[PDB]
Design an enzyme around this catalytic site. Structure first.
Site, PDB file in Angstrom:
ATOM      1  N   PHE A   1       0.827  -1.200   0.000  1.00 26.96           N
ATOM      2  CA  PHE A   1       0.000   0.000   0.000  1.00 26.96           C
ATOM      3  C   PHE A   1       0.864   1.255   0.000  1.00 26.96           C
ATOM      4  O   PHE A   1       1.980   1.270   0.521  1.00 26.96           O
ATOM      5  CB  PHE A   1      -0.950   0.034   1.216  1.00 26.96           C
ATOM      6  N   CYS A   2       0.283   2.344  -0.508  1.00 29.18           N
ATOM      7  CA  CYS A   2       0.828   3.686  -0.301  1.00 29.18           C
ATOM      8  C   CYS A   2      -0.255   4.537   0.370  1.00 29.18           C
ATOM      9  O   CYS A   2      -1.088   3.983   1.090  1.00 29.18           O
ATOM     10  CB  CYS A   2       1.361   4.288  -1.603  1.00 29.18           C
ATOM     11  N   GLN A   3      -0.271   5.865   0.192  1.00 26.12           N
ATOM     12  CA  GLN A   3      -1.314   6.675   0.837  1.00 26.12           C
ATOM     13  C   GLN A   3      -2.561   6.851  -0.024  1.00 26.12           C
ATOM     14  O   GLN A   3      -3.610   7.198   0.517  1.00 26.12           O
ATOM     15  CB  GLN A   3      -0.794   8.041   1.336  1.00 26.12           C
TER      16      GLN A   3
ATOM     17  N   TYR B   1      -3.485   4.182   2.698  1.00 27.75           N
ATOM     18  CA  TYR B   1      -3.345   4.716   4.054  1.00 27.75           C
ATOM     19  C   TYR B   1      -4.363   5.814   4.358  1.00 27.75           C
ATOM     20  O   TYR B   1      -4.841   5.913   5.489  1.00 27.75           O
ATOM     21  CB  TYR B   1      -1.900   5.181   4.263  1.00 27.75           C
TER      22      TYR B   1
END
EC number: 2.8.1.3
Length: 113
Positions: free
Chosen positions: A76-78, A105
């Site tokens: 995952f990233c944001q 996120y």
């Protein structure tokens, strides 16, 4: 094991000990806060992390290198885009358990109690 994992499924996989989390944002992003338990492997490092020998992975990341047969390797990233890039990269190297937490996120923070 589909290419995207939803938050409800992810929460149950974490509670059961069946998913591993990889925060693929930069080190300065992950240091400021991450999903609890996530290992930070910035997407720009991920190819080398998945290619390097297991002992080298342990040295750099202080965790055991995932295996190609692992399930629910969740990246995952944001906001989704780097998590998607990381998931595709991992799949391309044979990690059939790689999945993207597309909500990412910011959703994690939005849906936290």
């Amino acid at each position: 094991g589909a290419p995207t994992v939803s938050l409800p499924e992810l929460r149950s996989l974490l509670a059961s000990g069946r998913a591993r989390l990889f925060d693929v944002r930069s080190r300065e992003e992950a240091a400021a806060g991450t999903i609890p338990g996530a290992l930070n492997i910035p997407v720009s490092e991920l190819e080398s992390a998945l290619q390097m020998e297991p002992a080298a992975f342990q040295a750099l990341y202080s965790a055991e290198k995932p295996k190609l047969e692992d399930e629910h390797l969740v990246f995952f990233c944001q906001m989704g885009k780097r998590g998607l890039q990381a998931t595709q990269l991992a799949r391309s190297l044979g990690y059939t358990g790689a999945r993207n937490y597309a909500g990412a996120y910011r959703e994690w923070l939005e849906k936290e109690s």
